[PDB]
Amino acid sequence: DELFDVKNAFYIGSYQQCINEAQRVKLSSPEREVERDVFLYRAYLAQRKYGVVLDEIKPSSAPELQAVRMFAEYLASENQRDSIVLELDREMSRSVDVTNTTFLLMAASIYFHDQNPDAALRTLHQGDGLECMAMTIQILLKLDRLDLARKELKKMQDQDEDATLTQLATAWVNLAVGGEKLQEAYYIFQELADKCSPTLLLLNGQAACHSAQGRWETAEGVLQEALDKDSGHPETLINLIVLSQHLGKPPEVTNRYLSQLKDAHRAHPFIKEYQAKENDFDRLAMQYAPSA
Amino acid sequence: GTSPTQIWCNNSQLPVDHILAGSFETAMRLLHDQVGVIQFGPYKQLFLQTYARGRTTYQALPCLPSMYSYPNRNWKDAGLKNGVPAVGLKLNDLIQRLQLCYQLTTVGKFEEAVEKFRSILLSVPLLVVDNKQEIAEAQQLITICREYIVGLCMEIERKKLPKETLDQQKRICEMAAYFTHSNLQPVHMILVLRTALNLFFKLKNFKTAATFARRLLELGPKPEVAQQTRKILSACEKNPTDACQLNYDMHNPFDICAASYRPIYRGKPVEKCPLSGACYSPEFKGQICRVTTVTEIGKDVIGLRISPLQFRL
């Protein structure tokens, strides 16, 4: 696979690396060229550079790109989403085409955000690709059906044990499993970071593994390193808040990270949940509180 | 399937566990039954703070929603079924904070001290305690907090009341005397005794003053204070006598009404805060505890449930 580096960089989480390499790579095939562009834009989406994707991908572009763009608009425009899903539903039902894997992944992604796990899973079921399998496992884990997840993992495991995508998948299942497994997950994350490069994604994964186990202090270094690279990184800040409390840092510290998160991303679901909790708490207070 | 947070809720009675889970309503209920906590409002910061730490996050795939991890204190043994949230707050932490409270008391920062004390007191139910004795320490820790809170709060008021009437003065001395009873550490206990002695001296209730002086000396205050105390004591001896009768019985056991700051002798009916142990006169029952601020005075409760040891089968 010529694209191997580009894709691999993408999965690990080093988007810029993916973008840089994608450009360097030569097409050598109308097919490959399309795949390259797909990843290139996918990388931009990870970066959250929606405008880049929306502007550059134009109607004349290949259908694979179109799917990517579809996802991009979904992420970019909140208003557009219901309309997009409706169309997605229509396209999904009124059209058989399984072959376009990219379409399935993008479509599944939209459903995933839509929180229609069934639809996303339904779509993924059709897709053959290894990535489809990985995405499938991820959805199952969110579903909290580890058992189903395990089956898919082995499914991919038989196909390609070594693939990084497979390894990441195993780590995920692993993290979910708990127990001795956690160490296994830790090593895979560590190995990837060592081989490829510490990515924010990889660093947090390692931290999560350590945190799952008692080792709060060990976690400090990875988070600290991650924070240094990108302040405002959502996973990092959240982990820091959790880590800070275990460490016994001053309560202000936990608060500071939390506030920092709000600055970086007002929208972030973690923030929304936090707000939601505040609301019901007030609601509950009234319930218990004495009347006057 | 079943979410890990839910598993935690099913698994543990402890309120902190539920808060970590995010099950506020459940947690509040537990606090309501186990301890009196009617008024949750002062709790809000604790809940959110506790809640924030509950789960970690990592990203499975790019451009997808991030995954959440739920750490378990019994990670090794806990299967999918028997997980329980990691700790995060411990008894030692609370105990350590206590020193700061002591420091503030000495400085005279009483109002701030009350806040720190109350903060700790409220936090006690949050703890997960490993062993039986450790449970006792927690209870003891709570007791210390209320003792200071009621005592300090009484003191703040006493200063506020007017000096002018003789009756007003008798009131002040009485309150000062009540403080004497509070079980504080010797550094503080000495300080209060020192104050009471002066008030009683001016009151010309020398006989009572002498007793305070003797108690103070036993504590072993610094030498300057001790010398001063001896001086006052000798003066009192010249005319051992109390000019006025006060509503204070050094010998009879007391219980200070947290609200009224009036003595409740031995057997006399009292209503107590389920959580703090603070005492109130029967009138108060059903009202929000001044000390705790969260609890209901009258409420009957299961009792604090910090550790799983408490549950038996």
Numbering used by the authors:
A (entry chain E): 17 to 308
B (entry chain A): 913 to 1225
Q: What did the publication describing this PDB structure actually write?
A:
Coat protein 1 (COPI) coated vesicles function in retrograde trafficking between the Golgi apparatus and the Endoplasmic Reticulum (ER), and between the Golgi cisternae in both retrograde and anterograde directions. Arf1-GTP recruits the protein complex coatomer from the cytoplasm and anchors it at the membrane. Polymerization of coatomer at the membrane assembles the COPI coat, which recruits cargo molecules and membrane machinery to the assembly site.
The linkage structures are at lower resolution than that of the leaf, so we fitted our leaf structure as a rigid body to assess which subunits are close to one another in the linkages. Consistent with our previously published structures the central contacts in linkages I and IV are made by the αε-COP subunits, and those in linkage II are made by the δ-COP MHD. Interestingly neither ε-COP nor the δ-COP MHD are essential for COPI function and the combined deletion of both is not lethal for yeast. While the contacts formed by these proteins at the linkages may play a regulatory role, they are therefore not essential for COPI function. While the low-resolution of the linkage structures precludes more detailed interpretation, the proximity of the peripheral βArf1 molecule to neighbouring triads suggests that βArf1 could modulate inter-triad interactions.
